[PDB]
């Protein structure tokens, strides 16, 4: 059966998904299709099967109820970053998210159009109050820990009771099972001097920018990295700051050397409490991060696919989607008004005679179809290789959206008694390849029940970002170089890092990686987060101009994807699709 969610191993941007895109991007090979007969006609052709491209098709059909719509997508599954991973453990299914993790502060951030999409799909945000088992890990006495590595700190050491508040936090602050900073930092494998300095950072904040007005402070915190701020203004040693190096890897796709100090201040990082800075923004920082389908935001993609192509799965609503069986052979049936064609790379888009000719490549062979309208919902940096009408200024704009690589790894564990024995549900590793390691969010929804028994299997989620810290690289270059590091890495080398890290962190409490790991799925997102304007390297006014230029409509071709908003969130993918549809 054709069913990508059950596949393990090397996933995300799997082999087969990207070779045609690279012939265009790397070798500059062109696949012209204007010499081939038009095979199919549509009202709308959408390039890209992620949340944006599915939303584009969904709102377009809301406006044109009878529309015929083709969605071309080059992965072997729909959803883009929002993928569903599966494990089989002990006779039951254990679900995980391939990428797009949760709905980010949705009561604060979700536009009225996005809320409308969710309601029409039957997603009720308030349901997650009971679905997300918020007190599960805390009520077991579990806390978050930090893992220091031998190479950077002299010794391997796991220190728990971390009180560090996070930006997107699913744990109520009262339930951290955490210790005081003095007690927590006291266990850090650092010289006594370093420890006192870190403790003082918390116990005795000072105006490390005294003499500058508030405006000069805000300017300086914009053009100074967080790591430099701690080195030059707080005075921490080069060994102390390493503790902070990877904290921002997941939420920003880069480390503390590329994190603007002002952005660290907004994310709740330590060091600013006595600066006199001003403090809406806090309605978002404080919303609980509980809006998590058991396969992450893949549920959004799956709800949209079922709503657009009802033959694919039965059901309606957020409860039954979780375990709905999707028939991939029904996604692309002829005559059917909405068709989703996977394993196809769009290669050519061209306005003509009031419609859009679109070429794509599938199993090595070229095809040509027509639509009345086209929405580019692919990676914006791909659009110039496809869209033949672009001015050279607009193609250059689109090229500047250099996305960030990230690797979301799912690991099936035979049991989690080593986690229980160490009192932990989540680890931060300041310098290791994997900077976030955790037992998965405990969510019960539909017929799916989150794993509860420490003797029985559970899924672990861990994040690996191929940063090059402290090299003097701007953000775009760290993103490119990170992708080149991922390209040189086999699956065998990706697995060694997974097993080496789990062994060093969990080994002491009896972990054996060969014996205890019963599954690995690596979601390799070489092209992950959209670029976002970074005040350490970019100018706000030039970047905004470039952004709007890049998403400008071209005839009957509109530009969607979260890339168009320079904003890597599912609600931007939705809002940019909505803008694309209203334009046509
Ligand atoms: C690891 C990770 C975790 C995330 N977690 C969250 C989260 O918790 N909350 C949140 O709000 N956001 C999150 N995001 C942001 C995420 O990108 C969005 O939530 C959403 O998935 C973006 O969807 P999109 O449609 O804009 O782009 P995508 O889904 O990335 O792109 C659509 C598809 O177009 C395809 N494509 C490219 N070129 C072509 C071509 N020539 N022909 C055909 N198809 C093509 C791409 O391969 C891609 O699959 C996360 C992102 C990543 C990478
Ligand atoms: C699957 C693993 C992948 C790896 C390791 C990878 C790696 C890279 C690297 C190293 C580059 C050069 C640096 C850069 O320009 O960003 C690059 C460029 C590019 N990749 Fe990927 N890539 C992958 C998947 C994909 C996919 C799935 C697509 C299309 C959907 C894609 C489209 C491109 C394009 C268009 C460029 C050129 C960008 C430009 O010239 O502006 N790649 N890739």
From TrEMBL:
InterPro entries: FAD/NAD-bd_sf, TAT_signal
Keywords annotated in UniProt: FAD, Flavoprotein, Heme, Iron, Metal-binding, Nucleotide-binding
Binding site for FAD: 52, 73-75, 81, 100-102, 346, 382, 561-562, 570
One matching Pfam family: NAD_binding_8
Positions annotated to bind heme b: 22, 385, 483, 527
Record carries keyword Nucleotide-binding: yes
Keyword Metal-binding on entry: yes
SUPFAM superfamilies: FAD/NAD(P)-binding domain (SSF51905)
Name of the protein in question: Spermidine dehydrogenase, SpdH
Origin species: Pseudomonas aeruginosa (strain ATCC 15692 / DSM 22644 / CIP 104116 / JCM 14847 / LMG 12228 / 1C / PRS 101 / PAO1)
């Amino acid at each position: 059966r054709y069913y990508p969610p059950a596949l393990t191993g090397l996933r995300g941007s799997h082999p087969g998904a990207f070779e045609v895109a690279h012939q265009m991007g790397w070798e500059k090979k062109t696949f012209d299709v204007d010499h081939l007969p038009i095979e199919e006609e549509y009202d709308l052709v959408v390039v890209g099967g992620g949340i944006s491209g599915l939303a584009a098709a969904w709102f377009y059909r809301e406006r044109h109820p009878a529309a015929r719509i083709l969605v071309i997508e080059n992965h072997d599954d729909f959803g883009g970053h929002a993928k569903r991973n599966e494990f089989q453990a002990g006779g039951r299914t254990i679900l995980g998210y391939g990428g797009s993790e949760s709905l980010q502060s949705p009561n604060a951030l979700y536009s009225e159009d996005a809320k409308h999409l969710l309601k029409r799909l039957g997603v009720e945000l308030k349901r997650f109050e009971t679905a997300f088992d918020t007190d599960f890990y805390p009520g077991l006495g579990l806390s978050r820990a930090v893992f220091f590595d031998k190479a950077s700190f002299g010794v391997d050491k796991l220190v728990s009771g971390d009180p560090t508040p996070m930006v997107a936090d699913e744990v109520p602050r009262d339930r951290l099972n955490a210790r005081s900073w003095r007690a927590f930092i006291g266990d850090f494998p650092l010289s006594r001097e370093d420890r006192e300095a870190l403790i003082a950072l918390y116990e005795s904040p000072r105006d490390y920018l005294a003499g500058k007005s508030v405006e000069e402070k805000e300017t300086y915190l914009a053009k100074t990295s967080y790591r430099d701020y701690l080195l030059k203004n707080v005075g921490l040693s080069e060994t102390s700051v390493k503790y902070f190096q990877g904290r921002s890897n997941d939420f920003s796709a880069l480390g503390a050397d590329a994190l603007p100090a002002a952005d660290a201040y907004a994310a709740g990082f330590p060091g600013f409490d006595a600066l006199g800075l001003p403090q809406e923004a806090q309605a978002e920082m404080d919303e609980p991060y509980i809006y998590h389908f058991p396969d992450g935001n893949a549920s959004l993609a799956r709800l949209m696919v079922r709503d657009l192509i009802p033959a694919v799965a039965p059901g309606r609503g957020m409860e039954d989607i979780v375990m709905a069986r999707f028939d991939y052979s029904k996604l692309d049936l002829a005559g059917h008004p909405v068709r989703l064609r996977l394993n196809s790379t769009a290669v050519s888009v061209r306005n003509r005679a009031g419609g859009v000719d679109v070429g794509y490549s599938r199993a090595g062979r070229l095809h040509r179809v027509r639509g009345k309208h086209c929405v580019m919902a692919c990676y914006n940096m791909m659009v110039p290789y496809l869209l033949r009408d672009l001015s050279e200024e607009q193609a250059h704009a689109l090229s500047q959206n250099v996305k960030f690589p990230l690797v979301y790894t799912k690991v099936l564990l035979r049991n989690w008694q080593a986690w229980k024995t160490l009192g932990i549900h989540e680890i931060y590793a300041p310098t290791l390849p994997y900077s976030r390691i955790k037992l998965d969010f405990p969510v019960d929804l539909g017929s799916y029940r989150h794993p509860r028994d420490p003797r029985q299997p559970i899924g672990v989620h861990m994040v690996y970002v191929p940063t090059t810290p402290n090299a003097g690289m701007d953000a775009r270059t760290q993103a490119r170089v990170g992708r080149s590091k991922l390209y040189a890495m086999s699956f065998e080398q990706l697995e060694k890092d997974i097993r080496d890290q789990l062994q060093a962190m969990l080994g002491p409490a009896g972990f054996d990686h060969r014996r205890d790991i019963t599954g690995i799925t690596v979601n390799r997102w070489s092209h992950g987060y959209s670029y976002f304007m970074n005040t350490l390297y970019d100018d706000e006014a030039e970047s905004e101009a470039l952004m709007e230029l890049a998403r400008s409509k071209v005839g009957n071709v509109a530009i969607a994807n979260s890339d168009a908003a320079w904003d890597a969130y599912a609600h931007a993918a939705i809002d940019q699709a909505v803008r694309a549809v209203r334009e046509l």
